[PDB]
Design a protein around this nucleic acid. Structure first.
Ligand SMILES: [Cl-]
Ligand SMILES: [Cl-]
Ligand SMILES: [K+]
Ligand SMILES: [Mg+2]
Ligand SMILES: [Mg+2]
Ligand SMILES: [Mg+2]
Ligand SMILES: [Mg+2]
Ligand SMILES: [Mg+2]
Ligand SMILES: [Mg+2]
Ligand SMILES: [Mg+2]
Ligand SMILES: [Mg+2]
Ligand SMILES: [Mg+2]
Ligand SMILES: [Mg+2]
Ligand SMILES: [Mg+2]
Ligand SMILES: [Mg+2]
Ligand SMILES: [Mg+2]
Ligand SMILES: [Mg+2]
Ligand SMILES: [Mg+2]
Ligand SMILES: [Mg+2]
Ligand SMILES: [Mg+2]
Ligand SMILES: [Mg+2]
Ligand SMILES: [Mg+2]
Ligand SMILES: [Mg+2]
Ligand SMILES: [Mg+2]
Ligand SMILES: [Mg+2]
Ligand SMILES: [Mg+2]
Ligand code: NA
Ligand code: NA
Ligand code: NA
Ligand code: NA
Ligand code: NA
Ligand code: NA
Ligand code: NA
Ligand code: NA
Ligand code: NA
Ligand code: NA
Ligand code: NA
Ligand code: NA
Ligand code: NA
Ligand code: NA
Ligand code: NA
Ligand code: NA
Ligand code: NA
Ligand code: NA
Ligand code: NA
Ligand SMILES: [Sr+2]
Ligand SMILES: [Sr+2]
Ligand SMILES: [Sr+2]
Ligand SMILES: [Sr+2]
Ligand SMILES: [Sr+2]
Ligand SMILES: [Sr+2]
Ligand SMILES: [Sr+2]
Ligand SMILES: [Sr+2]
Ligand SMILES: [Sr+2]
Ligand SMILES: [Sr+2]
Ligand SMILES: [Sr+2]
Ligand SMILES: [Sr+2]
Ligand SMILES: [Sr+2]
Ligand SMILES: [Sr+2]
Ligand SMILES: [Sr+2]
Ligand SMILES: [Sr+2]
Ligand SMILES: [Sr+2]
Ligand SMILES: [Sr+2]
Ligand SMILES: [Sr+2]
Ligand SMILES: [Sr+2]
Ligand SMILES: [Sr+2]
Ligand SMILES: [Sr+2]
Ligand SMILES: [Sr+2]
Ligand SMILES: [Sr+2]
Ligand SMILES: [Sr+2]
Ligand SMILES: [Sr+2]
Ligand SMILES: [Sr+2]
Ligand SMILES: [Sr+2]
Ligand SMILES: [Sr+2]
Ligand SMILES: [Sr+2]
Ligand SMILES: [Sr+2]
Ligand SMILES: [Sr+2]
Ligand SMILES: [Sr+2]
Ligand SMILES: [Sr+2]
Ligand SMILES: [Sr+2]
Ligand SMILES: [Sr+2]
Ligand SMILES: [Sr+2]
Lengths: 132, 337, 53
RNA sequence: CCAACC
RNA sequence: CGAGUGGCUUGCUACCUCGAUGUCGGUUCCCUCCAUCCUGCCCGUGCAGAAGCGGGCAAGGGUGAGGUUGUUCGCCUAUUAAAGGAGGUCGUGAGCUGGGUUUAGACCGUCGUGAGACAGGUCGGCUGCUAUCUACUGGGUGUGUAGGUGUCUGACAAGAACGACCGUAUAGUACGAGAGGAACUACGGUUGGUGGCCACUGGUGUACCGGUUGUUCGAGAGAGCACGUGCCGGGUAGCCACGCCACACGGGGUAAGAGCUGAACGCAUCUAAGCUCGAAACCCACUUGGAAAAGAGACACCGCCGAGGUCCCGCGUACAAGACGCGGUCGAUAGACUCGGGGUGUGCGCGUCGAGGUAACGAGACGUUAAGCCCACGAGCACUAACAGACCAA
RNA sequence: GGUCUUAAGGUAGCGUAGUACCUUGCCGCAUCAGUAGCGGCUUGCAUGAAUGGAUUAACCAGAGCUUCACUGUCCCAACGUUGGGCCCGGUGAACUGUACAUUCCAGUGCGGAGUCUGGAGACACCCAGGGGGAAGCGAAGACCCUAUGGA
RNA sequence: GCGAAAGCCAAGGCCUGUCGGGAGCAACCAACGUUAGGGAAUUCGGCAAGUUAGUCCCGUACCUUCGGAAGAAGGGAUGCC
RNA sequence: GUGGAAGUCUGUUAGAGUUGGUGUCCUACAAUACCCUCUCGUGAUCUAUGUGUAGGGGUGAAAGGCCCAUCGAGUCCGGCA
């Protein structure tokens, strides 16, 4: 993928429960897999800011629950490092549901997004209210 | 079905024993291209700080932008190429033929060697030139030593001696180039060899940790879950199969870890100066203050503070040189805190 | 930059930026400041702080 | 599979 | 239908072992095989492209995470370049586990007149040992080569030190009616592996500073105990990873394969002689060890009445003993002191205020006070201690 | 089959059960995915009425399953504490010992060799270590069979 | 303090749950403290560890042999002067 | 409201016991020990001393448990070489 523009310490693993920062009807997401990732023996697959992940809906509307969908990690509590050395961290972990073209399934995003995620997923960005 | 997994640790840095010379010894030198020139230099590790640089990379989306970069400060005072040793080619490889020494010696070089009192620089030179005419001359190197005294933070006064190959144009031309340096006093500096922005390979004896177990030394797992409470916590599963009936040297075991020679490749030289611009408030921890010839190496360098590190022009650079990077800031913030 | 908590200047190539839930931003110069803020202390009531001084 | 008797 | 190879399954045999070679599965750690799952290079196609399908060379590297089940196997899920198979006493219990299996208790079904039986099911149910030899990982002392210091050589030895992927430009281009849709090459990044380092972020930090509960020292001050910090907050050095740095290109020879010249066989023929090319594979490049390489090495200088070394002393860039390294007045090596740089968070005492209360009394607030306390770091400084001194040595 | 053996021929209930071989039975629930678990169906290899059937509030260091909370069980390990470990003074055992013994790769051999054969490697001694091998030490195999053995 | 509970302290007893000396004191082991983000992914199985916790006020379901279930659950309060 | 029942609850009160760690130990401190966790604790309770039941016999809320480290038939000596 296109260089992110910052160094990330993956703060999530397969099975982690995160916030769905959009209005798709899904409230809580569970990480199932990380696109393009391949680990090592015993290592739990990890995901962090900027990664595209497959997810299942743990909490939300009946129609959304249990659906297996693609998403994009927009926020995480574990810090990340920007070119100027500063570390950046969020209040929670969150992802935005996305389709085969990486366009947000929802109409609006909730909460701030990291600028680095904007680079990668422009259409996701062209839905962001706040970009930090 | 027993998943695959790479082995624990590399088999290419063994045996993992205590190094014989604390002074690093390069086992390779740059190729002969440009004009003749000493292919290496040395210094003493002081500590680290960071510097904000202007992205130099012409292929970077950030070219021309601020960038914080970690730097290891190495005090690189002038050294003295004290002699010229010649190697001849023989059926059994290269062998020292003779050496051309000088008269001017640093006041304390006698803390390591028995300084020459009676030598014939011309008989030596003569034998060497005859070797070239004959075509039996191997490479040409300079016996070099440091000047610990120039460095206040380092307690040693006893100079460290190392041999550094001289490469360059034609042998005749660099042979003459070698003889010139030596004769003077051999006093040469970091500037004479490197330019800020070039890539250097740094060699040094790592920090010692004495005896350590397989977990730390080879990176084997610790025992897990229930297997961690029965009486074994940091011991590997087994020393090998029933057959072969012996323990292979490849199984991870306890032993000396640290204090090994390592040659770190492609370290970019961020800046070569003199003075106290890089020094840190309060002084570099366990080292002291810097105020003299110094080099800022990008990133980390093997060894503890005060150890002798060696520089060599990168023998296998991956990227082209981008000379004299622009340094907009050099942190001097205390390292205690 | 200045630390949004104690007031001292943040040494370049240092510190962390915490991104609040509402999108706000707080630039901390160190863990000490972060940790006092986490405790709910207001920099103005802490004597050693530049803000307080 | 299997680690005895069936 | 015919001919074989393997020794993973199963069967057969009873050769070895019953004065015992602990039994399945898993786990951990190491080496290997190729009948190749991916990656490199090829050939064919019912090969336009993209992609499939089949075949050849090839074992360098990789082959992962999860749900049921003790399970092996397998079924299933999302990832992936791919998530290959097999040998090592079905590698691995003087390594682990004890779910299964596999005693003694007990139950169900079936069988038995009964005692009791059932690779049928079910609940519970015990794992000893201070390593002699050998093996290997690391560390020493001697002898040999035959006075000392310093610097090297390189026979050998180890490496995967690197493997893989995504993205961009090429390019909505070649190809194709369209749908769809490449490559050479140049770049940016990720992942797995590898070695090192602590400026940054993060952890620790029973150094340290603060808050505070119970109790005891009459109160105050200052302290002990509450497990080797009572509890809580912060955290220097150091050590660490979750942090940071670095880990090619290029040559040489080949396999499959593509060809050249070319005859036996006037022609033809990549082959028989000769030759041009051509794989992640082989060799070199790179890193690490390496004078005990018995052909036991090379060079330079010093010394044989003295070069050098030992004891001793102050110490760590070193360290389980040993070893290693630095300094010893020609000196800043360690400590004291004073600065500097750090940690904590505003000391004792006193003064004002303070809900009230006749008063006594009074939790607490402000000032004095960027205070007080403390520091495994740095500088300065010979104040103290590196003194005195003994000895070996061609 | 629409009686026959041997008296009767399984009723109420319960049911894939701590009983179902087939079997991961089929449907549903729950999970990304559930040989598990729960509900239903049920022809029950081989349920069933004091050989008690069903049911059941309360109780339980009894067996199985799910959820919330939490966490170093795990990803993936780090730093620290106390006692050992290491060095020194003193005290001072035991297990084990046919012999030799510096081994390694192959082979051979009663087919599972440090000692046989061929090669390879190998200067002596000592310290620390984790235990690959000595089919290691400990116990005349608790299994199996055999004995004109025992209980 | 509810307390013959914990913890601390008297009277009284002891330094004999009887080998010491030394190394910032390494590997490894026994007990144990602290661990960012994730939060059972570990495992046959949450085994081990942890979470909760005292007292008062509010409030408390299915089911029931009417006893119980129940401290269900869930929520709030707590010092000093 | 009183009353204060209970093979009733909590409880390391005394006291009794022992689910798990398959922790420590396993030439032990110990031929059944140590630590934490855990269960009972007004009763078919626990406990001291005295006393009775004896080997094909006792005793047994039954595990072939127990009858002096010994039990699907104690121990000693004898039968017995
Ligand atoms: Cl995955
Ligand atoms: Cl393990
Ligand atoms: K046997
Ligand atoms: Mg695993
Ligand atoms: Mg620091
Ligand atoms: Mg800082
Ligand atoms: Mg036989
Ligand atoms: Mg045995
Ligand atoms: Mg093949
Ligand atoms: Mg291989
Ligand atoms: Mg086996
Ligand atoms: Mg074994
Ligand atoms: Mg065993
Ligand atoms: Mg043992
Ligand atoms: Mg079971
Ligand atoms: Mg069982
Ligand atoms: Mg059986
Ligand atoms: Mg069922
Ligand atoms: Mg009846
Ligand atoms: Mg026997
Ligand atoms: Mg039997
Ligand atoms: Mg009989
Ligand atoms: Mg943590
Ligand atoms: Mg698992
Ligand atoms: Mg438990
Ligand atoms: Mg009695
Ligand atoms: Na143990
Ligand atoms: Na074995
Ligand atoms: Na065959
Ligand atoms: Na096994
Ligand atoms: Na391969
Ligand atoms: Na499975
Ligand atoms: Na075996
Ligand atoms: Na065992
Ligand atoms: Na096993
Ligand atoms: Na080649
Ligand atoms: Na019946
Ligand atoms: Na009970
Ligand atoms: Na822990
Ligand atoms: Na062994
Ligand atoms: Na019997
Ligand atoms: Na004594
Ligand atoms: Na009444
Ligand atoms: Na117990
Ligand atoms: Na009898
Ligand atoms: Sr050298
Ligand atoms: Sr070399
Ligand atoms: Sr155990
Ligand atoms: Sr063997
Ligand atoms: Sr035997
Ligand atoms: Sr082959
Ligand atoms: Sr392929
Ligand atoms: Sr199966
Ligand atoms: Sr098997
Ligand atoms: Sr295996
Ligand atoms: Sr079992
Ligand atoms: Sr079974
Ligand atoms: Sr049975
Ligand atoms: Sr000899
Ligand atoms: Sr492209
Ligand atoms: Sr199109
Ligand atoms: Sr204490
Ligand atoms: Sr508490
Ligand atoms: Sr060919
Ligand atoms: Sr020699
Ligand atoms: Sr019926
Ligand atoms: Sr032999
Ligand atoms: Sr040992
Ligand atoms: Sr007293
Ligand atoms: Sr005594
Ligand atoms: Sr702490
Ligand atoms: Sr689980
Ligand atoms: Sr699981
Ligand atoms: Sr509550
Ligand atoms: Sr009771
Ligand atoms: Sr009780
Ligand atoms: Sr047990
Ligand atoms: Sr425990
Ligand atoms: Sr025992
Ligand atoms: Sr009572
Ligand atoms: Sr007895
Ligand atoms: Sr007799």
């Amino acid at each position: 993928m296109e260089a992110l523009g910052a160094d990330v310490t993956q703060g999530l693993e397969k099975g982690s429960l995160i916030t769905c920062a959009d209005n798709t009807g899904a409230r809580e997401l569970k990480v199932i897999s990380v696109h393009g990732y391949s680990g090592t023996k015993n290592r739990l697959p990890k995901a962090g800011l900027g990664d595209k992940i497959t997810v299942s809906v743990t909490k939300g509307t009946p129609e959304m629950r249990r659906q297996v969908l693609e998403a994009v990690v927009v926020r995480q509590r574990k810090p990340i490092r920007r070119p100027d050395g500063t570390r950046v961290k969020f209040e929670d972990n969150a992802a935005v549901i996305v389709d085969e073209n990486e366009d947000p399934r929802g109409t609006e995003l909730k909460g701030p997004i990291a600028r680095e995620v904007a680079q990668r997923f422009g259409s996701v960005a062209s839905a962001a209210t706040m970009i930090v | 079905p027993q998943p695959s997994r790479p082995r624990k640790g590399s088999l290419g840095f063994g045996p993992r024993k205590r190094s014989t010379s604390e002074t690093p010894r390069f086992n390779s030198w740059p190729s002969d291209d440009g004009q003749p020139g000493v292919q290496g230099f040395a210094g003493y590790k002081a500590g680290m700080t960071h510097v904000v640089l202007v992205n130099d990379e012409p292929n970077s989306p950030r070219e021309g932008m601020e960038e914080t970069v970690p730097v290891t400060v190495i005090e690189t005072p002038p050294m003295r190429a004290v002699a010229l040793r010649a190697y001849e080619d023989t059926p059994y490889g290269q062998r020292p033929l003779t050496e051309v020494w000088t008269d001017e010696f640093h006041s304390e070089l006698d803390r390591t060697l028995d300084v020459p009192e009676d030598h014939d620089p011309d008989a030596a030179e003569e034998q060497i030139r005859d070797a070239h005419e004959a075509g039996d001359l191997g490479d040409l190197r300079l016996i070099t030593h440091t000047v610990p005294d120039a460095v206040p933070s380092v307690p040693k006064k006893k100079p460290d001696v190392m041999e550094t190959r001289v490469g360059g144009g034609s042998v005749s031309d660099r042979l003459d180039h070698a003889l010139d340096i030596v004769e003077d006093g051999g006093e040469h500096a970091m500037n004479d060899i490197f330019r800020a922005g070039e890539y250097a390979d740094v060699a040094g004896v790592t920090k010692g940790k004495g005896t350590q177990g397989p977990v730390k030394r080879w990176g084997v797992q610790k025992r897990k879950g229930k297997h961690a409470r029965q009486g074994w916590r940091r011991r590997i599963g087994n020393l090998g199969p029933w057959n072969p009936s012996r323990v292979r040297s490849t199984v991870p075991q306890q032993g000396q870890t640290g204090y090994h020679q390592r040659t770190e490749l492609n370290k970019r030289l961020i800046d070569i100066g003199e003075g106290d611009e890089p020094t840190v408030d309060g002084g570099f921890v366990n080292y002291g203050e810097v105020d003299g010839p110094y080099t800022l190496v990008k990133g980390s360098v093997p060894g503890p503070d005060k150890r002798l590190v060696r520089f060599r022009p990168a023998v296998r650079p991956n990227d082209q040189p981008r000379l004299d990077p622009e340094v907009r800031y050099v942190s001097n913030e205390s390292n205690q805190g | 930059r200045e630390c949004d908590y104690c007031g001292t200047d943040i040494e370049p190539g240092t510190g962390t930026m915490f991104v609040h839930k509402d999108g706000a931003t707080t630039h901390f110069c160190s863990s000490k400041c972060e940790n006092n803020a986490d405790l709910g202390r207001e920099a103005r009531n802490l004597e050693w702080t530049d803000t307080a001084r």
